Ligand binder design. Structure first.
Ligand code: SF4
Ligand code: FES
Lengths: 406, 94
């Protein structure tokens, strides 16, 4: 039976059933926006509350959002990034690649197993939250990990294989079932439940306490952006706004961005570039700059690759030493994450932009919020995690790759 | 070139230009396929070469070994000759 069907089996069992376990589900914002199309509506018509209300009525016990898991990823990946930078200034190498996309990791495991140490060891948002709920939440609520079943709604089919990774176990799964937008939307229609006719429900807090999804009001700008932001703000001491990715002439689908990082006055980072100055991909040393006064800095070269067929033409440019970058994010979708194979198919060649724009409201877009300001995240990183890249973090928040694929 | 596009809903033998990728012609005619990038991004839009001949240069990891087996990126590939090509099937290349 399909993993989706397996979820429906447990859901069919009564809440007070002796063999019924706790079925928690985590949805992604990219799904919440396109889920409306599955009902024949406009992208973004369905509210996050309506979705949660519908899911809870499907038989689920706890409804969480991937945003909470992403908040953790931003912290871990950001810390690993900062680590890679600081260590290079002191004298895991560079460049550093983002690991969220399951399509990208498969390529570095089967096609380019020489870039393994170049990619982050941090796990994906959903895989982080799934591990967190089956541990911290399990212990806090007082439930055995075997009595907890978790489902996730992802806009990509490749996400199931991601959660199907052998070593992704607890302490036989961190994530048991993954359902796509198209499938979820069909289930709603099959049961006769229209999300457009549902009231404003509510989300569950992965912390076990408090009302809400555990996410504060405000966008992060994305995993890569928020990670870079966290590192930048700690390295420079100055706030970082939204990054405007510009397309690279010669490479379609490839966007780059240069971030001028200046060491904060009175920090170890400032002393690094003052006390000293001077793999298949050998770091060029970083694009640095200085002034005639003695104070300079370094500009971080970030690049985003959209598509697996785009990575092939990008890596070859880096191997030749033509395209010099420090941080590169590789996506397995045509544009962002709102255009995965698990997403609905409407008559529009540019339906991706609509979903991307309807991802957040005008207020949410204007209100910037980082993961290091989240009380829930702060608490988790205190009562259970202890510190980023720590023991527990390396256990459930980090992972490894396999040379040859899974 | 008349290409027999195999779909879950049957087949669609439409006319595909030699200068235009089958992907565009498919949806423009009336078929269930994901169209947005075209520059070879997602592998979900990879067709299956059942017979005939197709031409692809800039693609993903599915190179000649896969092409000769029946794997082609219809977003950046066109039929060099009339033939039958499957559409929805990204699992056969994993
Ligand atoms: S982009 Fe496609 S594949 Fe990568 S995470 Fe978002 S959905 Fe999964
Ligand atoms: S349009 Fe995304 S590859 Fe077919």
């Amino acid at each position: 039976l399909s993993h989706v069907q397996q979820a429906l089996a447990e859901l069919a069992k009564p809440k007070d059933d002796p063999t019924r376990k706790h079925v928690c589900v985590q949805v992604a914002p990219a799904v919440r926006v396109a889920i409306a199309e599955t009902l024949g509506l406009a992208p973004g018509a369905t509210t996050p509350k309506q979705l949660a209300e519908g899911l809870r009525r499907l038989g689920f016990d706890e409804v969480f959002d991937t945003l909470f898991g992403a908040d953790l990823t931003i912290m871990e990946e950001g810390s690993e990034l900062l680590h890679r930078l600081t260590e290079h200034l002191e004298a895991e190498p560079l460049p550093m690649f983002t690991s969220c996309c399951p399509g990208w990791i498969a390529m570095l495991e089967k096609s380019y197993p020489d870039l393994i140490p170049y990619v982050s060891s941090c796990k994906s948002p959903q895989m982080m939250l799934a591990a967190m709920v089956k541990s911290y939440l399990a212990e806090k609520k007082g439930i055995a990990p075997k009595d907890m079943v978790m489902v996730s709604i992802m806009p990509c089919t490749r996400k199931q294989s991601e959660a199907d990774r052998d070593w992704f176990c607890v302490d036989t799964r961190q994530l048991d079932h993954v359902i796509t937008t198209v499938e979820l939307g069909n289930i709603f229609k099959e049961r006769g439940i229209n999300l457009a006719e549902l009231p404003e429900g509510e989300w569950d807090n992965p912390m076990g306490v408090g009302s809400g999804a555990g996410v504060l009001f405000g966008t992060t700008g994305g995993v890569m952006e928020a990670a870079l932001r966290t590192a930048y703000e700690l390295f420079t001491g100055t706030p970082l706004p939204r990054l405007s990715l510009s397309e690279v002439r010669g490479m379609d689908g490839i966007k780059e961005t240069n971030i001028t990082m200046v060491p904060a006055p009175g920090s170890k980072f400032e002393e690094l570039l003052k006390h000293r100055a001077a793999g298949p991909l050998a770091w060029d040393g970083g694009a640095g700059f200085t002034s005639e006064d003695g104070r300079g800095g370094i500009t971080l070269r970030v690049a985003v690759a959209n598509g697996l067929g785009n990575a092939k033409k990008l890596i070859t440019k880096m191997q030749a030493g033509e395209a010099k970058y420090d941080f590169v994010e590789i996506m397995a979708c045509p544009a962002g994450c709102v255009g995965g194979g698990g997403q609905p198919r409407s008559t529009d060649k540019a339906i991706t932009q609509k979903r991307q724009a309807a991802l957040y409201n005008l207020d949410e877009k204007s209100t910037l919020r980082r993961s290091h300001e989240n009380p829930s995240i702060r608490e988790l990183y205190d009562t259970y995690l202890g510190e980023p890249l720590g023991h527990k973090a390396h256990e459930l928040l980090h992972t490894h790759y396999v040379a040859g694929g899974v | 070139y008349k290409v027999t596009l195999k779909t879950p809903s049957g087949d669609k033998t439409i006319e595909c230009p030699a200068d235009t990728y089958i992907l565009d012609a498919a949806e423009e005619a009336g078929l269930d396929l994901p169209y947005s990038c075209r520059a070879g991004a997602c592998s979900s839009c990879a067709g299956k070469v059942a017979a005939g001949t197709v031409d692809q240069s800039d693609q993903s990891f599915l190179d000649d070994a896969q092409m000769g087996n029946g794997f082609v990126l219809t977003c950046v590939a066109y039929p060099t000759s009339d033939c039958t090509i499957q559409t929805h099937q990204e699992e056969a290349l994993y």
